[model samples]
Target: VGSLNCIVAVSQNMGIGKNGDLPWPPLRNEFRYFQRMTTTSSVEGKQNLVIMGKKTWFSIPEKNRPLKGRINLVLSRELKEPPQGAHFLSRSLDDALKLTEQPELANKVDMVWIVGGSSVYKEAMNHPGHLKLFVTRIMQDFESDTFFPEIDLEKYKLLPEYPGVLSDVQEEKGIKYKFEVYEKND
Candidate 1:
């Protein structure tokens, strides 16, 4: 019934995967874990959605198609029509919001996960008022074709940040990470 008041991302520098694919990089498994943590929760339920660009959708490997039960809203300027099975295709952030108004789709959604390539996140970040972010900081770095646009931290109030042991998790993806949540100060 309403637009996103929450935004989330895995990497500090956002980029499209190789060959214009979805933006998950070499340390993507960790990103997937982050995605799972946020979406599969008691509160998320049916209203939860992942708002991303067309490229972000394409980059997701076939084994993980459709993001399962979550709504996948694609935002793109080029597509005149919505992609098959997509919840919606929006030309701008405002337009994308209208899709969120569907009767069965509103409320109970806490976060608008911005799984992206740079421009998509940038647009969300620039809006400022409409977004609260959950940022994951990874210890290692790799060559990246795209970067997350910088913003003034003063606009956000950090809720909490927990840095965890790399060994605590089942897999060893050679990345150490911290979970930090931010909300708009107002």
Candidate 2:
């Protein structure tokens, strides 16, 4: 499996979404942070594999279906074909990881990014892979129906400052938030 990283934005109450969409309005810079992190690769000419659940895949508007540089892998047992511009359709996390090992994509893939709703994030956290968490903490609460799962701090230690990540609390639209990175210790 490729190096796996999960990214999410959660409220103080751990709320992630509502009505299949982001509960809060767009945080442009914060979203830009998401874009920058996922699209970055250590090796030149390598691309990252972004894996997301079916609904999460559709959350982004059609114009941005295939997120620019990264390969989009949508997780869905029901889907027969890769939706619109998706590069791959995976029945499970295991199946998605296998794509990273394929002859053509093996060397090209630098990381496996698990972008999610709730269940998908839970599975990736428990998956036996080199896992890392990139979370954006939204200081305020919103009416939300979907949420991010609770992470065991003992298993994943928070880094005070991670390389390549801006290490300061950011404020936007009267809301304060910070980017956090947690690495699996066991």
Candidate 3:
């Protein structure tokens, strides 16, 4: 029963995507932040798990499809097999987490990170588990057809800072953003 972390970059209005892609120009460092956070683990020899919905999975660039260095889990009810680059495919959010808990996999995975589309994020947020939200607060508004679900503040508390996460406002090409963590109340 390991805890989970949902990682996302949301603009001022919580906008996440435009059509099927990013709402704004890709900036420097944000991708790096995402790469590092989801890939790193405190325990040696253990990898992390990054779960994405089917649409979000293919939305990634072809070359980066599997999202190297971590166990890629794609959720789908339609696909019978794991996507060529993905490690596993599951029916839903809860089923995916249950698969990770199989005794054979328990030791191999250190963390479960939810990298999203709106529906999946909503399911993970509503699931009764110890989950953390690792949000990159993009300090500008964007025209998005997709948006991250609002956090239930009464159930989660925003942390002042988190280890290995840059705390101050960061800018790349004049776009300002900051890393944030919200821990579900114990």
Candidate 4:
């Protein structure tokens, strides 16, 4: 059993998307935070794994994806094979979780990160392994078609702080937000 972490930004309405794109204006610092955390590897010469739903995958610009240094795993069932530029594809979150445990990838992957749609995050939250939610709390509300899953306060405890995580509130386009980590209590 390995660790599973999720990264997401949600507005006051718990919104994560709008019409298949980000609901809010781009936040440079927030993007930097996501890129740095997901790309960082604890073991020498190994890469971290980033998993996301099919829609989430296509939501990214093709030129900038496969996401540079990380191993990109797209979760999909309808697709017959790994999409162009993707490293792996899985039918379900459980299957994707298993992929990380297989011998070949087990040695190469330093971490498993879920970057997602609501369904993906919901499944990962139920995973019995060590779990963490790297959440960005946006203080403004937006008109969105998608939202982050409701985090069960009983199942996770918000940490006072975490190493390498910025604690102070951040602002971009006049909207305020802050980074928070919720660790599973088990």
lDDT of 3 by residue, 43-113 (tens): 88889999999989988888877999999999999999999989999998889988987987898999889
Pairs of colliding residues, candidate 2:
none
Q: Per-residue lDDT for 1-186 in model 4, tens only?
A: 245799999999999999889899888888889899989987788989999999999998777788989999999889999999998999998898888889999988887889998999988887675799999999999999998888999988999989999899889889899999999946
Better of 1 and 3 by lDDT: 3
Per residue, candidate 1 scores C-alpha lDDT tens digits across 77-172 of 898877776766788776666556655555645446666656777777777465666665654454456665775678777765433323332323
Clashing pairs in 4: none
> Higher-TM-score candidate among 1 and 2?
2
Regions of model 3 farther than 4 Å from truth: none
Please report how far candidate 4 places residue 40 from its true position, in Å.
0.6
- Model 3 / residue 114 / CA error / Å: 0.4
Q: Model 2: which ten-residue window has the lowest total lDDT?
A: 123-132
**Estimated TM-score for each candidate:** 0.74, 0.96, 0.96, 0.96
In model 4, state the lDDT of residue 21.
90
Count the clashes in each prediction.
3, 0, 0, 0
Cα lDDT tens digits, model 2, 110-168, are 98788897999998888664689999999898889999999989789899898888878
In model 2, how large is the Cα lDDT of residue 182? 94
Residue 123, model 1, lDDT: 73
Q: Give candidates' CA RMSD values in order.
A: 4.1, 1.2, 1.2, 1.2
